[PDB]
Ligand binder design. Sequence first.
Ligand code: NA
Ligand code: NA
Length: 298
Amino acid sequence: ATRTISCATASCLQSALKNAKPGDDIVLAEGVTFKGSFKAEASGTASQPITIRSAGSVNPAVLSGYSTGGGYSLYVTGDYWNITGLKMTGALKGIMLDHANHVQMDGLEIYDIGDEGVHFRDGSSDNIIRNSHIYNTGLIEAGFGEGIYVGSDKGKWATYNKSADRNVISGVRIGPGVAAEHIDIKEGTVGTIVENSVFNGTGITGANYADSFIDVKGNDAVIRNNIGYRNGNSNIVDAFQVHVQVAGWGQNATFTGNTVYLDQAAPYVVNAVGDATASAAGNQRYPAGNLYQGHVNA
Ligand code: NA
Ligand code: NA
């Protein structure tokens, strides 16, 4: 690191973020809860990232908001942050990224969130969340309780840049207690990857159409080598869906190598609705039952 800033109070962290520089290593004391609405605004580079991390993993540092009904645990608006080994809780959103790029989130535990756990928004691209667990979301609004939310609905494209592109979700556990989709990939996004992840469907509510592990409304999504457990939750109607919200979106979704445990024969593995298009290969369904619906090239 170029500079080490060791913090054990919220005031220390707030100051370290305000004064953040490329190459900073902001190291948060184990066992401490840092309460605030913390803002990661500066930008690093690939060679000089800005790091916020827990000092160790026995008792990770916690970033808490003030109330599940407001704010965020962390709001990232700059590029080239490494956010590592932290817990995030106690806010309306866990981590919100606005126009933030090349952010690496690793080893996070994000839980007890009013709305959505992680949201890539306003053009935030080329980011990764890996080796993390998101659970207990949608405590305030179930229908806004996604685990991971990529991009913006069409009604917000005039407000936020829709092109939250090439974001990667790798080796993540989502659920239980995630009230909406585990992953909602919005129209306007391109190239989202969801890989090597595990979906515990207990707690998906069905609110606001949220009745699958993943809904794919963006393009060029790659959904590979994941495991989904419906766990008898009747609110889950399909493992994965693809929808067209705007013509030419919900296109070219690829589903390979996934294994889904859907309890009964009725849920589909991939339900590509209407004009949506997908390709599928190597997916395993338990028990025997419905596989693909729609324009699915199998
Ligand atoms: Na749905
Ligand atoms: Na949703």
